Design a protein around this ligand. Structure first.
Ligand SMILES: C[C@H](O)[C@@H](O)[C@@H](O)[C@H](O)CO
Ligand SMILES: C[C@H](O)[C@@H](O)[C@@H](O)[C@H](O)CO
Ligand SMILES: C[C@H](O)[C@@H](O)[C@@H](O)[C@H](O)CO
Ligand SMILES: [Mn+2]
Ligand SMILES: [Mn+2]
Ligand SMILES: [Mn+2]
Lengths: 591, 591, 591
């Protein structure tokens, strides 16, 4: 009922089992290590929903099987989703490691001399790899004194990266993906793969035909009082763009209201379907009040719904935003055109950062030659080598305007718990609602148009399913760029002026698909992509290794790739070790 | 007889299915794109046999399954062996793609803004990869205006490279490889693998014992009128070399004329076996008149035939040349020593270029130190880093002399439809026929000795079968070099002066087998290679990807490798993605 | 009974089968090649046990299957473990190659022009790869005259590397690994994998509970005379160290003599268990006199034996050394803590070099910042980039002190047949025997403390078993460094002053795990490693390819990797070709 038993982090203090003074002289330091680790995690980490992260420590230090078993008994009743084993000394490898085959696991060995914790680390990892249960290694660079209790910056970074990814894995487990509708215009990702969700992500799929949304609307299976409040909020805050439809299709005020009204109801009903709504019990809809336990959803839309009813532009834009008529909240994950694979990339991004995700059509690659030819401007700066036009077909999280600001005053996208109502209103003020183009969307609709501020670091990702290989992940870190007004207008009126725009410039590496901007575009595996704030490729890489999804393309620095130590046994090559290891271990949950 | 149905190219114009003016406004531009594609292909391409290429266009634009089905019906009765789907707009991915699992497929999406054809391209490719039916991508670099009907250079290159390789694939399908004889001196490639031909190339294998050649000659199963003509031509044109059998094993008793007569008969009979000959019906040999429908053949020769009858040097040299007593014609593909794997490399080279192929023994690697020691000259130019001696054991297509000339006057090898009678005669004049060395070829024979002109770009290739892996392809682009007269003679007399020579220098890259000339030699997987005119490694790489044969070695620029888009999902590494993708998809026809 | 039929090298002179002059003119040169090869091998190689290597040559030259069969019959009764086929001419590929699927095979083709041996080489190799029985290629760089009988330096290097590795393979076949005890402190390598030994190495595993060692000691199942001699030798040569034990635990006089006496007995009994001892048969203990035919062993020790009896430090240090009370001898291979995987690395190293192997705990990585912080000295030279502290928990071959000297007077470790009594005594004089720390080793013991001289080239290796992948090899060439007297003391006192130390600096490459010293440590797959004298990575790589064990990490120059030619067919990439080939061929003996 909200806070539906969030996963916890289990900390396992391991120790030398022998006495005669040995174990007893190490007891305090070992538990301190465990307490220090828990303190750091609960302080620096938050679930994507906003809640604080809880850690569970073993009742005693673990020196053998009896103690390990006791710890396991404690953890399994506490819903721990990942573990971190810590130690400042030598311990008995296989008798003390966490044997659970599915939960993400890490081992931190104190780097000391009188305290040879790193020696255990190496021995424990060897046992993990020999037994087919990969684990992450956390080894600090510089030697620490036996009395030093601080956690080095390099160790802290790895602990946080491991836990952040680990939590993402644990949070998806058991949740549903709501497929509202089916295949949208033959888009591969909208042919929802039930097995992928179940085997790789540990999720379930709930399929619902779109006539169900029509039923909730027509039969008043919604909160009527909330509707009136949503309309008041729209009236007070919505800035409307110009209608670019052919004259015969332009709707008079009354009809335009009917579209706005229905559009807001769509947002309400979809949200209610995803997480349930107790108010529905008040109106005789107890079954419907339960929801589908969905942590992500997709709305087919075209062609069947949109050829007669308002499109999902408004609903998708609002639900994916960090706010609405009820104030700021955690953004939902709703994929347009029911593209579940983009939904998955969005889910991952959200679980890792707690921020709103931008759904985008990778529409055009603008070479510097093409820019010059159509606008006369000889482009420079981040856009010097080409630019990719990212515009979703009508919706995008309003947070995407990048009107929020960080400590230093820079444009950014932040976790909902750091967004002020002022920033929420600013994002709404930077958005214009434009009527949907009638020939494509016969039932009408309202698109969210904004222009993302330039100079913002972004990470573009996409998951694709390749028959005979399985799922693969693509990553491209880059920046949004700002084009001079005149140039932006030429390009914008030539493409789709009523849709949200983000001009993207990927960081080039000079090798492979990152030789130039054209290659990044040419090697993208679908027509959609997801934008997550910042340069979080390293996080996506760690998360993918936990799920055994090969990263077929990325521009992240080799030194920043952090995966279970077993990957290294599969080769020195960052790509080869990945394809070999993933094929070896396979999906986390089955087959 | 001849022109036995050549494969056609199917062009599929795909379009957005919705009306209200949308589809009707895109119809003309879409069909124009199809027509422009057909025009370009029929104009720039020719079948290796010289015939023009025919394209079949769908009767209507394809927007969904009903239309896709109608198109398929039309194509299947027209013998189309490869398709190219073209479009200037968004279309419904899985409802419009070519589902045929075996034919090569490509998609060309117009790179426009009001015309988002590339958006469809990316979506359709994603569906191809999700459904395990890989397709090639044709995406132009620069944005074009909606009214622009020209085909950019970069788009034209990809279209031609795809079509050229796809035609090669479609042309081999259904044809036979004629194994005349069996294993020649334990040479691996002469242990003909029937499964390889059937599963990978879609061909059949016809084995014929060599006693059948003896029968055709002894029982006069050939055109007597034609033999008279061949002899006349030989007498009139053959320049003879000095005999070298220590003034003992020579033919002063006129067995020389008998050998010549038999050698030409071998050429006639082998040819008749390959494609048939209606004249044989006139003399009662109707079964023999049919031929074996062979598109390539191998003649065992040693040891069993050559220990008593004239060797195959003359027949092989003539058959592989672009001319004979009947004028210029398409060269045949006849592998010496029945090395079917070299025959396959030759087949590929011929189907891709329409030119004669040079069969060669990779005989000696000459290091610059070795050259200086034996001749005194410190070599420079292309030969500066070492040189490889390529000499087949007595035969080579006379075109190999490089006496033909291109527009700019450079020495070259051309498709038979561009070879003039003058050029054919010039090639014959550059060749000297030398008597076979008795101790090796007891039945006698005549070798074709010529020296290939220096500075000509060549591509050396070889196909090998690795148990546990399957077939692999090796490519090495380089140039023929010209050695100063004093040097050539020292090396030539020291090796095999009566055999055709080609001094080869491979382009070095500094990495792998291409670190130095010695490594190129050391990593070649057999004692034979095939030389194809020009630097056509890129075409061989595209063709190999269509047949799923891994390229284990090559020196082609990374930017020039063009394969189905699915390959990228298997990795950014050019080699790793190949081995992984080939193992995934497997042979095209079975298992 | 000693000299238990050492494997022999078979030399196969191959030749053109045709008479009438050909074969007869080549007979003498071909056999000379065979004789020259045998002469070189027997002169430059020695079995690790000290014996000279014997070569068996075929009775006649091999030109076909009848002769090949005859040769095989002769070889199989002579215990040949590897073959080298030599030839100066063209021969009949598949009819002449060695078809044995398990023995290491090489082919040396003379690089001449009148003598086209290289042409046969390439053909034979192609047959080997097509038939799934990989073979090594020996092709010289520079062309030789037909009358030249010398073996070039580059050819010599490849012949020796192949033979040395091949002998190692043949020597392990059929021998046992003695597991004295079971798992030691949960260490993965001590959970002995019977299948690994049987399938990959072709060895057997003999398990013996440690109570058996207790029984031999208590029931006097050993040579009483010898013990008297061992004690005399110890009394006269052992230099003792400061007792670091807490005073209440310091044992003195009587007890100390008892610990020494038992420690030496452990060495004797373990040795007797490995190779048998006839003297035991004299005393009526016949079953025990046989031994277990063990070529390598591991002693569990902790926790169960050491919690009550003297530890294995002294036994392990003596047995792994090249000398003891009986003079210099071949060192034994005894793994501490029964770490069989380190035992295997030691076995390989010893079989390849014939020298003593150093067992080590990869204890600490000292970054330059860490060094500076704790000692004040800013470091340069080999130690400039960081250093790795290698210290085994109490024992190490005394040879490890590097008190032996080579021709040039440099510190080194030599094959026992080159070690003089003077050097043996020098190593013992550089060692101090220190009492074991009571809380860890309650039964007592004596550790061998010495400091390895700096500037000596070393090769650190490790074998690990990765579930789902199989065994993998790790290599890291580097040098031991010498730290200034003041710095060494700070670090040594801070760690474990009573244990043998080796400061190691790995050669950096700038790529992968060899970017910096930290990465070398962080990517080591266990807490143990083996040190072999010199830079023998190339030998380890060749040996591994013969056993199909992928090398997951190494810093050897790409030009020095020598593997069967079939590896190249699996790719140009040194790593990718390896994983692909190893997966293809699998273990040498089964499954
Ligand atoms: C309006 C078009 O149908 C639009 O919906 C498509 O371009 C859509 O983005 C497919 O991804
Ligand atoms: C004359 C020799 O037998 C010659 O035929 C061989 O070298 C042949 O080239 C094998 O490839
Ligand atoms: C004394 C310790 O138990 C010591 O034996 C361990 O560090 C051992 O080296 C494990 O590898
Ligand atoms: Mn879209
Ligand atoms: Mn040949
Ligand atoms: Mn140890």
């Amino acid at each position: 009922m909200k806070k539906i038993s969030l996963p916890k982090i289990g900390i396992r203090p391991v120790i030398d089992g022998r006495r005669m003074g040995v174990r007893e002289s190490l007891e305090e330091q070992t538990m301190n290590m465990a307490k220090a680790t828990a303190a750091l995690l609960t302080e620096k980490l938050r679930h994507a929903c906003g809640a604080a992260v809880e850690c569970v420590i073993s009742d005693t230090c673990i020196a053998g099987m009896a103690e390990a078993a006791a710890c396991e008994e404690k953890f399994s009743s506490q819903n721990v989703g990942l573990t971190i084993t810590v130690t400042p000394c030598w311990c008995y490898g296989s008798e003390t490691i966490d044997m659970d085959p599915t939960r993400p696991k890490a081992i931190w060995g104190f780097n000391g001399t009188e305290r040879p914790g790193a020696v255990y680390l190496a021995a424990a990892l060897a046992a993990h790899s020999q037994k087919g249960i990969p684990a992450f290694s956390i080894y600090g660079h510089d030697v620490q004194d036996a009395d030093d209790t601080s956690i080095p910056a390099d160790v802290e970074e790895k602990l946080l990266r491991f836990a952040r990814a680990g939590l993402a894995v644990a949070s998806m487990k058991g949740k549903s993906y709501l497929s509202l509708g089916g295949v949208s215009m033959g888009i591969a990702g909208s042919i929802v793969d039930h097995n992928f969700f179940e085997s790789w992500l540990g999720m379930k799929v709930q399929a619902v035909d779109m006539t169900e949304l029509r039923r909730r609307i027509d039969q008043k299976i919604y909160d009527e009082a909330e509707l009136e409040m949503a309309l008041a909020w729209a009236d007070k805050n919505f800035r409307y763009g110009e209608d670019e439809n052919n004259k015969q299709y332009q709707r008079n005020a009354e009809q335009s209201r009917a579209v706005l009204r229905e559009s807001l109801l769509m947002a309400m009903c979809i949200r209610d379907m995803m997480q349930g709504n107790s108010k529905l019990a008040d109106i005789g809809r107890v079954e419907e009040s339960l929801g589908y336990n969905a942590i992500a959803a997709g709305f087919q839309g075209q062609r069947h719904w949109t050829d007669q009813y308002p499109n999902g532009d408004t609903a998708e834009a609002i639900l994916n935003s960090s706010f609405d008529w009820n104030g700021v909240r955690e953004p939902f994950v709703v994929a347009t055109e029911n593209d579940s694979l983009n939904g998955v990339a969005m889910l991952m991004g959200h679980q890792l950062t707690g921020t709103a995700q931008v759904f985008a059509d990778v529409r055009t690659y603008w070479s510097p030659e093409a820019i010059e030819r159509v606008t006369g401007h000889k482009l420079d700066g981040l856009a010097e080598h080409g630019i990719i036009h990212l515009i979703n077909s009508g919706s995008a999280a309003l947070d995407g305007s990048c009107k929020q600001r960080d400590s230093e005053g820079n444009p950014t996208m932040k976790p909902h718990w750091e967004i002020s109502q002022q920033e929420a209103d600013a994002c709404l003020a930077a958005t214009e609602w434009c009527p949907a183009i009638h020939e494509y969307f016969r039932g009408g609709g309202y698109s969210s148009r904004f222009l993302t501020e330039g100079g913002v670091p972004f990470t573009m990702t996409r998951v694709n399913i390749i028959k005979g290989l399985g799922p693969v992940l693509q990553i491209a870190e880059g920046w949004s760029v700002e084009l001079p007004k005149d140039v932006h207008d030429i390009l914008n009126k030539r493409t789709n002026s009523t849709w949200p725009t983000t001009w993207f410039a990927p960081r080039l590496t000079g090798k492979g698909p990152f030789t130039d901007v054209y290659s990044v575009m040419a090697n993208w595996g679908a027509n959609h992509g997801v934008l997550t704030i910042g340069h979080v490729g390293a996080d996506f890489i760690t998360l993918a290794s936990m799920l055994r999804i090969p990263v077929c393309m990325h521009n992240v620095e080799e030194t920043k790739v952090y995966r279970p130590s077993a990957w290294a046994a599969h080769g020195m090559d960052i790509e080869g070790q990945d394809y070999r290891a993933c094929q070896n271990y396979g999906p986390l949950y089955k087959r």
